[PDB]
Paper text:
Mammalian NF-κB is assembled combinatorially from five subunits, p50/NF-κB1, p52/NF-κB2, RelA/p65, c-Rel, and RelB, into homo- and heterodimers which bind to specific DNA sequences, known as κB site or κB DNA. The DD alone mediates protein homo- and heterodimerization; the NTD and DD together are responsible for DNA binding; and the NLS region is flexible in solution and together with the DD forms the binding sites for the inhibitor of NF-κB (IκB) proteins. The mammalian NF-κB p52:p52 homodimer together with its cofactor Bcl3 activates transcription of κB sites with a central G/C base pair (bp), while it is inactive toward κB sites with a central A/T bp. The p50 and p52 subunits bind to a 5 bp half-site (5′-GGGNN-3′), while the RelA and c-Rel subunits prefer a 4 bp half-site (5′-NNCC-3′).
Residue numbers in the entry:
A (entry chain B), B (entry chain A): 34 to 329
Write the structure that this text describes.
DNA sequence: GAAGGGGGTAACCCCTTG
DNA sequence: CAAGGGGTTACCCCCTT
């Protein structure tokens, strides 16, 4: 869209299913993969400097989930990283694409958060006056920290890629616009699991409903879940599972009774969809097929 | 059951399903119940002084699981307790039975264990030499502590009732033999809750086996557990569920295929039992009935 | 409200496998 | 080791009478 040189995320990170590691857990536990990684094909976050060919330097750091992108308490740890959480690669005059195949997220302790925060905030405001730092600003620097620690989500981070075109000097000194990735959720964090149907005991029934199904899923909250049956033919037929939270077994299974199909006296089987749906959210699981059958 | 007065545990504590509380959790989280408590009928650990009627003092403290009963790092907390973990009641000249209806177990931190240990050990060896404790004696007492902390199970405790018959003095100075209860497992610990079958999708099958059942459980260790089918000591015939640990869905469910019954073409249907059984241990869930059907 | 239960959350500690 | 994963502790809350 912009005429000038710019960075583009070729492959965003995994928005779900990456674990943030604490300082104690040990240094390599896996690298942040790409949004299209599977067991066979692994992919990693990738970016490219479009609208220029030449030597250049791309760096990533963790920013808040909040759109005004501020530095996160969390740091990137990796084979290619600063001890501030800043990861740096060099793109060759031919290859303008940077893959970041070994990126970890160091999870800060809540009792660590302030000091880690003032430390990244100092580092940030050192270019304005590198010789020395005044109390007059150290007081107000600590003021950001406190206000940020109150609202900062330790479960969600965003990669921020900052590209720098090496100048005539030999100095990698020219900035490009910084490009912020989609959010990255901690896999080991409260709720915010993607609703998954592992398997079900029945995939067929009668048009009459009332057929009892055992559904195995990933963690669900007994009071926030439902089982939506539907046909997305724009008729927009929908009905629901019949159960009580007691029927939701230790947040990993649902025993429900199928609803009746809208139209009985059907002559042939009809395939519909069912899906888990959080009422409190909008969030849905992958839909599975269910086939209604005719009568007597 | 010899000549003299002795104590007897009328109602032992619940060997499973009691939670030990840390110092931080609070007081008043519930009392150690008797082995026969239900939500309607509550019962608490009870003991009686046999072969004597008169004023007497019974005290309870936590001892190791190890047969040589040594004092546990854990302390009893409650309305009737010392700050050392010693709980004391008085039995009247009429009623020689003592109920302990509010007993909590204060869980020591592993970094607390040493100091709590030397402190209970001093208290133990303070009537042996109350004047002072000699430096020479100090280091031998500290040794016990270290070699006891290495093998002491913080998940299992035993109540030790020490009864004392009050003399003519007014001094509760006569000892009875101390009676040690059966072990008490921390509910919140590795394998110390009860294997439970919540519900199953099928309670009947064919003699041929291979019928797929969804079983909902309380918890499982995925590669620990099995599904034992068996007869009522007809011969003790037994067979097993067919499933991989992949089939055990997240510690709360098992999808298995029923085994074939030993004798096919049974003229009419046969009811057998199935049960969860830890492969490692002996431990079994409550058995559920399953009915085999003949062929056609 | 406190008692009397129970479940979730942070931080860490591990164990499988290559 | 790397790359996942699950389980453990100490603590923090939260429902119900």
């Amino acid at each position: 869209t912009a005429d000038g040189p710019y960075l583009v995320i070729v492959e965003q990170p995994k928005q779900r299913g990456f674990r943030f590691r604490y300082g104690c857990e040990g240094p390599s536990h896996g690298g942040l993969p790409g949004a299209s990684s599977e067991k066979g094909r692994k992919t990693y976050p990738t970016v490219k400097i479009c609208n220029y060919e030449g030597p250049a330097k791309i760096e990533v750091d963790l920013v808040t989930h909040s759109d005004p992108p501020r530095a996160h308490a969390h740091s990137l740890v990796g084979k290619q990283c600063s001890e501030l959480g800043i990861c740096a690669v060099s793109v060759g005059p031919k290859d303008m694409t940077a893959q970041f195949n070994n990126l970890g997220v160091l999870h800060v302790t809540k009792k660590n958060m302030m000091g880690t925060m003032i430390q990244k905030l100092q580092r940030q405001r050192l270019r304005s006056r590198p010789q020395g730092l005044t109390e007059a600003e150290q007081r107000e620097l600590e003021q950001e920290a406190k206000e940020l620690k109150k609202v900062m989500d330790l479960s969600i981070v965003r990669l921020r890629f900052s590209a720098f075109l090496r100048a005539s000097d030999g100095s990698f000194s020219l900035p490009l616009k910084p490009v912020i990735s989609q959010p990255i959720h901690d896999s080991k964090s409260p709720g915010a699991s993607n609703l998954k149907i592992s398997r079900m005991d029945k995939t067929a029934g009668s048009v009459r409903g009332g057929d009892e199904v055992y559904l195995l899923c990933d963690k669900v909250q007994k009071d926030d879940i439902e089982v939506r049956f539907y046909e997305d033919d724009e008729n927009g037929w929908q009905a629901f599972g019949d159960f009580s939270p007691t029927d939701v077994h230790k947040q990993y299974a649902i025993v429900f009774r199928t609803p009746p199909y809208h139209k009985m006296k059907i002559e042939r089987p009809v395939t519909v969809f069912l899906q888990l749906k959080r009422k409190r959210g909008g969030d849905v699981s992958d839909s599975k097929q269910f086939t209604y059958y005719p009568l007597v």
